[PDB]
């Protein structure tokens with residue numbers, strides 16, 4: 001279906017708690033929470049090939065992958081990882097990540113298109129799940 005589009009954030013829950021697990025100190029967590037409320041996501045989907053651009057006020061990152069094929073990106077706190085995306089259903093995908101170097105919490109993300117037209121992103125570190133909700137621009 002239609003993950004493709006320009007998405008703007010309307011809600012962000014538990015992001016600070018996620019960063020805390022990931023070792024980010026309090027002042028930076030607060031500033032990162034503020035940056036997250038300006039998050040925008042651009043998606044182009046062709047079959048199971050995805051191009052995804054996630055940006056805030058001063059930063060932009062591009063993610064390109066094909067479902068089922070390993071690729072490299074970074075974790076939320078910015079560490080290089082190897083990632084692999086699989087479908088969980090018609091309109092939900094789940095990404096498992098593995099650190100390229102060292103150790104750290106187990107991280108992952110999911111993206112889901114709901115029947116109400118929302119895009120739901122979850123990001124996980126161990127026990128803690130951040131949920132962000134987007135709507136089309």
Ligand SMILES: *C/C=C(C)/C=C/C=C(C)/C=C/C1=C(C)CCCC1(C)C
Pocket residue numbers: 032033035036039052054055056063075076077109111121
């Ligand atoms: C498929 C969508 C993905 C994997 C989204 C990834 C988003 C991030 C890695 C966002 C990170 C951010 C920070 C680390 C602080 C600034 C605000 C965010 C949400 C852009």
